[PDB]
Design a protein around this ligand. Sequence first.
Ligand SMILES: [Fe+3]
Ligand SMILES: [Fe+3]
Length: 321
Amino acid sequence: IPAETGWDSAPGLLEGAMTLDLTPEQCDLGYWLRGVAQGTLAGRAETGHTDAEPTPEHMRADGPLRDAQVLELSCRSVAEAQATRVLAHYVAQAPDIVELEFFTTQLVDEARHSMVFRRHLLAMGVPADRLHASIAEVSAEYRREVLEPILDFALTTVRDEGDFVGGVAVFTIIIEGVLAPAAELSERKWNLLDPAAGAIARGAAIDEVRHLTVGSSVVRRHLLRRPERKAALLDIVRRGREIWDGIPDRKHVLRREELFQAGMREHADLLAGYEVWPGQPLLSTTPEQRYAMAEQWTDRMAAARLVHMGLPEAIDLLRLT
Ligand SMILES: [Fe+3]
Ligand SMILES: [Fe+3]
């Protein structure tokens, strides 16, 4: 079982994305079936967690803590299922077998993430016969305002523009690159309050390390074969930024962070020592501070990944100087 896919041996999300070099040739379908399906997911195939990482009863009880997680995972379930639909087009247009296999593995991961998030909703007492409606009601505004515009950018680049590597650049820099750090924050936030959700996030973060580093290899390699494509890639990044500047993401993050605030306040006994990041107790953080930290992580990670990709000028386009 490769070190990078092992449940105990795999790096954290930022750490892996900023330090590892993985290529689509390495992470082919055999590697995924062995190292992921039979590795990372050993004992966690159905729900993403084991009996030792349970969903607490307090996550089934009506209140702000439960609402914060309902809102969060309704939204992520939709994000991941729509990402699966988008990535399908990356598979269909994969320029070769290496990319076909790799992007098949990413597609299944995203479908898996959607599945374990939705299952977690059932484990929190959302009735099975109200599950579809409930996710759809809760996530509708976020889907329409945030997910659809950024995902349509990727789809438009790969499909309408016929630009595969460009499409990968949208997905790794503008989509995953932007959202993965908030996923690691979510794992830190939830780990004591909802161990099942912490383990679910952890397994997703291991997958995400692979998506981020393989996507970077695709862009990096293309760019040094075709150095002329550099301006085109930078324009992709610029348009990406312009699209985020018009999306009201903050509004949706702060809404779940204020629910979470009331939630964690009502469960301070489970949180005592707990630091959300080095030297910072979760209990003494605010919604704005957790949003800001997730942004700081996003900026740091992008600085590191853009250099590795050969697009250090995008650090400027994304206003990271
Ligand atoms: Fe995912
Ligand atoms: Fe991903």
